[model samples]
Target chain A: LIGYVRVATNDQNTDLQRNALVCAGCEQIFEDKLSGTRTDRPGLKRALKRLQKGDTLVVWKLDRLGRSMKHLISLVGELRERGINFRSLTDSIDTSSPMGRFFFHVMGALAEVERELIIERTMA
Target chain B: LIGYVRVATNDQNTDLQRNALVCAGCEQIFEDKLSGTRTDRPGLKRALKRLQKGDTLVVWKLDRLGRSMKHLISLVGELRERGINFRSLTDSIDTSSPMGRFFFHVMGALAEVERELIIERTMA
Candidate 1:
């Protein structure tokens, strides 16, 4: 499996995520020491380009792999079409499993509201 | 004064920040339900445009105002040149005060290492 990671410095811990990915069977890990909302992160772009059909893309957390819930679902959906899988160690998101699929759908359902709720919760 | 806010659904409370900004004497508040790393946020753009010389730009937290510490400093510096001030309620950052300027300089000193350290610490 291939792994992706990010740092929040914008405390996001990359090594912790890297170690988790390694322990979780990821043979390679890609990381960016940038904000999660940045779509131009070269590391994530590299990770996306590196994945092959039937490969699994893993991350330490769901947020590590996406700029938003909608972006996360879109990325995973594209991976599905490419015969690849997506997994998040902390978020229990694994596109290769039926249960994971259900969770993914639920997340998709809540995707539009994700930003609003998150901002409300954090600022609250 | 002008205010800018963002939601985390990415749980961030824009209202909490908005209320704080309003109470802090912000006559208008601009909000984006989008991610912070996005420089294209229309709300921030609008807020920037609305700001005049001698205006104070306020936010609930520093992260709510910037994609990174470097970006934050750059933005505040630009504002300073325009005779604008910057303030964060939670971060103790204000460009108009000596204490705040000291903090800003300290942050600038650490900005380069911010991303790496943040990622390491968070993952750990």
Candidate 2:
């Protein structure tokens, strides 16, 4: 499995996610320290490029994997189309399983609405 | 209850946290966009100063509350001494409860060791 980790700030460490990824048996790990909303993640891009058919793309959590639910769903969907699997350790999602795939869609849809509401409240 | 939310980078939002705190009935929310390790968080400082005995201080998560386990423990201990309560929403910790207080220490200790190990590995 291949892993990806991220932390938005300079003071934060990817240590927790990195440790979990290593224990999850990831041979190679990619990382970035940038805003989750930013699209310019070089590490994520590199990991995507390195992935092959049947390879698993893993992350510590759903929020760690993408900028937003929209982005997350689209990205995971693209991976599925490419014949790559996706896993989120904390979220307990593995696209290799039927249940996991179903829940991934459910959770992604819920998160999108959740985020929009949060944004509305914050703006108010 | 009073709340504090933080995001380490400018591109991130404390929207989710702020929404949760508001729904939790927080009358006031303080926030900072800075490294958790930095002691120069004016927002956190203000929140600390505004808290009174018998009041609860809330955060979205444990890692969002302090820089590390050591800092978290010490800060919570200080809060306890002053008769101020602490609560972490995601962590489900409430300092007013014995079990919660016990778990807080346990988790903090575990996290410290976990962090040390990750640092060692990263430096390797």
Candidate 3:
């Protein structure tokens, strides 16, 4: 299993994310304190690259994984396609559970809503 | 002013982001096809580092700015601190306008809600 923690910046605290992961039974944690918007996050890339079949990628919250619903869906899709398991301790979103799996679809739907709203508002 | 376009992968389309910015009166565009989770996106970093005061960083949607709410807030905060303006064409979020400013707060609140929901669901 791989544990991940992140904050937007160095000045921000990773303690909440870290503590949550630890409470949820993650013994090993990888932490990154960089802007969540940057797609070149070294720590997350390393974790994803290191994951193998049956290995788990655990995070404290869904947002810790990325900045947008589209990004989250893409990440989850990659994990599912790769046969990797993902768990978000705080959001109760886990690929290991039925509800978590459903939540992924819900996230996709929300992303779609967000996208449509953006288009509609922009054209207004 | 600098306009931006992004897609999660090389296989994804950049036309949506590009077209939106063009429709919004932005002529010059910087495009990147990279995952939102990766923080080392070369194109985004170069754009950020290259931006000067009064320059604009325009995108199609707020999500295009990042993968998570924390990330988005951090990025906007950084730009504000640097006196750089940001505009999301699709979302109608323009830092130059009062409504746009209010939208930032709404985004922040939603992110916090997302974080809390994740925590609650996980602990259940």
Candidate 4:
């Protein structure tokens, strides 16, 4: 499996994610030591380019992607569409199988609904 | 004086962390393999209990604190008040003195602020 990690600043540490990625048997790890919101992640870009069909994309957590929470789920789904698999170590997620992928989509849609409701409730 | 490693997943491995602690001169190392959200960390409790006044508490990373990201600062603050020190392997942080501690706080807060903005904007 390949791993990816990111942080917003040089002050923050990616060390925690790195160790877990290694333990998860990641062959290589791509990292971004900058703002997660920045869409300019050369590391992530390189990682995606290097990802091959049927390869597993592993990461320490959702926030490490430095993108919208949806970006991760959708990105993985697209990767799966490209014949890749994805895993998030902290969340105990694995979407390498057809069954697992379907469930993740279902879960992602449900999360959107839940989050919207939370926003709506807080707004009202 | 002692080291601690915590992974937020049963699927995650702490192997990368094991050797680093030894290289850092940690005689014994403690581990926690569970979700970071769980507050009942017997491993952390044990590690903390084992800490001596002049001892240093080391962790592979901050997320392993498993609680209020504030917990580490507060806990370390309390420890330092009690004459202990803290360090995170990946961040080059050494809280053995006042200036070192302030530098860590300054740099660490800047990164968190960057992340918070990113998360907030993405949610918006």
- Full-model lDDT for every candidate: 0.61, 0.67, 0.61, 0.61
Off by over 4 Å in 1: A10-12, A35-37, A108-114, A120-124, B1-124
Q: Give the winner by DockQ.
A: 3
The TM-scores of chain A alone, one per candidate, are 0.77, 0.86, 0.71, 0.72
- Candidate 4 residues lying further than 4 Å off, grouped into runs, are A1-124, B36-42, B66-69, B114-122
Chain B of candidate 3 versus the native chain B: what TM-score?
0.71
Q: Give DockQ per model, in order.
A: 0.02, 0.01, 0.03, 0.01
Residue A97's lDDT in candidate 4: 47
User: Candidate 3 on A21-90: residue-level lDDT in tens?
Assistant: 6777765768776654544566777776667887787766565555454345455656666778777665
Using lDDT, give the best candidate's number. Answer: 2
Q: Judged by DockQ cut-offs, is candidate 1 incorrect, acceptable, medium or high?
A: incorrect
Predicted candidate 1 versus true structure: per-residue lDDT over A29-116, tens digit per residue: 6767664355455667777787798888776655444434334444566666678877767667676854355455444334424543
What C-alpha lDDT, on a 0 to 100 scale, does residue A74 get in candidate 4? Answer: 35
Q: Which has the better TM-score: candidate 1, or candidate 3?
A: 1
Q: Candidate 3, after superposition: displacement of residue B100 in Å? A: 3.1
